[PDB]
Design a protein around this ligand. Structure first.
Ligand code: LV4
Length: 171
């Protein structure tokens, strides 16, 4: 059975208990913490691509009101995010299983862009999700996994200074 684990879940949970925030810029900003996934149970000899996307966790615009994030009462259906391909893709199962798969180079933006960068809507809440795509073989297959621990709100600047301090402390 294909097993997918989050690496450093301890640390993600410290961000989640404050409500995590990720900066978006026009040029794109790398994530901290980095999503790192432990994968076992692949066919070491089969070929896979690792894809990352961001599900809109709800339809609401969020605002930091007097020290607390609060959703609005004007939600709308959210266009789904673009998919980032892990730059090691495509690769053998053995490649993916020898170390945590680290999405260190994805950049989060707020603007339609040259490509690579993933566009999010500022002040929306997102749940990172991966797709493991068995490629090249006769039988294509997809295993998907969500990481609730890694939920965040996309922001143009940090609102909660406890997040700012945690980001620096652990970077
Ligand atoms: N989920 C997506 S958008 N996958 C994808 C991305 C880039 C090229 C091809 C892709 O899918 C295909 F291989 F199944 F066609």
């Amino acid at each position: 059975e294909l097993r997918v684990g989050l690496e450093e879940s301890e640390l993600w949970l410290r961000f989640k208990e404050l409500t995590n925030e990720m900066i978006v810029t026009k040029n794109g900003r790398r994530m901290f913490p980095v999503l790192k996934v432990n994968v076992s149970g692949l066919d070491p000899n089969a070929m896979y691509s690792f894809l990352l996307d961001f599900v809109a966790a709800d339809n609401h615009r969020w605002k930091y009101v007097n020290g607390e994030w609060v959703p609005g009462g004007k939600p709308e259906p959210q266009a789904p995010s673009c998919v980032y391909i892990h730059p090691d893709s495509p690769n053998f199962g053995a490649h993916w299983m020898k170390a945590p798969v680290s999405f260190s180079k994805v950049k989060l933006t707020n603007k339609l862009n040259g490509g690579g960068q993933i566009m999010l809507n500022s002040l929306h809440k997102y749940e990172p999700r991966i797709h493991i795509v068995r490629v090249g073989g006769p039988q294509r297959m997809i295993t998907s996994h969500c990481f609730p621990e890694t939920q965040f709100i996309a922001v143009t600047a940090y609102q909660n200074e406890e997040i700012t301090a945690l980001k620096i402390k652990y970077n």
